[PDB]
């Protein structure tokens, strides 16, 4: 079993370009308006991205029209899925999902919540997992058609060119190897924090983008002072407007840089979300014959897991 991690969404940062440039300043705002749509279109660009981030999450996880549930009796032919199935006694998440979550961490800058909260993603991954375990690929293509798990594996083995009698004759061995492999995933994730570096990296890049944007407020940009209130307190309008104009150009330029970087970065995340959606559709709901698409080896099955800002797949 191998683990593959793909980012799905960004933090939904929204910036008030007027407050950022001209915070509580009528004189500055009147000058800012001389730039027309330069401010407004930035608010629009960021809004568009925030919407896209919810779209990305839905395309990846909301691939099932029903919420499937496993039976109270885990009679899956010796295959132990309790480490990837949700724990009802707790946030309805699996042991591995909790491990994944525990390893990733006034300037007009606000952050909007995602439409789908962590427990809702957990419900989608639970449904997809329950589907994968009890009905194979049919919950994907049509109705969820129950099949004995060992029998489902028989189909998965024929799908890679290995006659299903191999599975049945070695069913105890296969179940034991599977159960061991999942246990190894728990240890790998618990021990190595860097295992989820891709998700942490997205968080770190976005954090830096905002820290840079805020620090730019301290810049003078040729003005006598980086503080708008000090310019207004010290100078009469005939000159104050000149000093303010210098700050507006610098701060407006700073936002344009920020927004451009967010849009380019968003394109990268979107591409990853599209890939993640593709893998879930072809790797989890089906049986990919694409080499190294679902990890090294011949693909038998995979299970999705939720994670902060992304999805983690366990490829069997």
């Amino acid at each position: 079993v191998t683990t593959e991690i793909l980012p799905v969404s960004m933090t939904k940062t929204s910036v008030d370009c007027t407050m950022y440039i001209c915070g509580d300043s009528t004189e500055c705002s009147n000058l800012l308006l001389q730039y027309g749509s330069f401010c407004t279109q930035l608010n629009r660009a960021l809004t568009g991205i925030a919407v896209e981030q919810d779209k990305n999450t839905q395309e990846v996880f909301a691939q099932v029209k029903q919420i499937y549930k496993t039976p109270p009796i885990k009679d899956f032919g010796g295959f132990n899925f309790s480490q990837i199935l949700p724990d009802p006694s707790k946030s309805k998440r699996s042991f591995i999902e909790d491990l994944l979550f525990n390893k990733v961490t006034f300037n007009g800058l606000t952050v909007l919540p995602p439409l789908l909260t962590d427990e809702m993603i957990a419900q989608y991954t639970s449904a997809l997992l329950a589907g994968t375990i009890t009905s194979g690929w049919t919950f994907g293509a049509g109705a969820a058609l129950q099949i004995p798990f060992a029998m489902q594996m028989a189909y998965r083995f024929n799908g890679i060119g290995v006659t299903q009698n191999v599975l049945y004759e070695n069913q105890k061995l296969i179940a034991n190897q599977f159960n061991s492999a999942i246990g190894k995933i728990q240890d790998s994730l618990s021990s190595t924090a860097s295992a989820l570096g891709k998700l942490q990296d997205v968080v770190n890049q976005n954090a830096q983008a905002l820290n840079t944007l805020v620090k730019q407020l301290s810049s003078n940009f040729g003005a006598i002072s980086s503080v708008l209130n000090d310019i207004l307190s010290r100078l009469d309008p005939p000159e104050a407007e000149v000093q303010i104009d210098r700050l507006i150009t610098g701060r407006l330029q700073s936002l344009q840089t920020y927004v451009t970087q967010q849009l380019i970065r968003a394109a990268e995340i979107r591409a990853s979300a599209n890939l993640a959606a593709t893998k879930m559709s072809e790797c989890v709901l089906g049986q990919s014959k694409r080499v190294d698409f679902c990890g090294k080896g011949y693909h038998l099955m995979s299970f999705p897991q939720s994670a902060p800002h992304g999805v983690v797949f366990l490829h069997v």
């Binding site: 919420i67 496993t70 006034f106 439409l115 809702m120 329950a130 129950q146 004995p148």
Partner: protein, 115 residues
């Protein structure tokens, strides 16, 4: 961040006044001119009122029943217009359908459709 009062030797923190974007939830003017207003990331004490993680929602009635999402607000909450007023609800993710799994039973299609 903070200042020293020049008359009294005490230090005071300055917390900028509450603010946030304002979004309007509209059923569509072809059906209704009634709207609900969301004050983003603020407490209702500063602004038929529902406090949600996304902000303070005013004018929408909170309903305990789950429904498929129509106009999204955020943090699991969506709005809709129903028999009439604007309501807010936790969105449903899908229909619940347990699978009749057992170790000796298989479901096999007997018919099909072309779509």
């Amino acid at each position: 961040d903070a200042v020293r009062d020049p008359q009294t030797l005490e230090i005071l923190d300055i917390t900028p006044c509450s603010f946030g974007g304002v979004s309007v939830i509209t059923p569509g003017t072809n059906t209704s001119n009634e709207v609900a207003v969301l004050y983003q990331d603020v407490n209702c004490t500063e602004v038929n009122v529902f406090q949600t993680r996304a902000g303070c929602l005013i004018g929408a009635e909170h309903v305990n029943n789950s429904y498929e999402c129509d106009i999204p607000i955020g943090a699991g909450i969506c709005a809709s217009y129903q028999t009439q007023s604007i309501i807010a609800y936790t969105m449903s993710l899908g229909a619940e359908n347990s699978v009749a799994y057992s170790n000796n039973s298989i479901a096999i299609p007997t018919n099909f459709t072309i779509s």
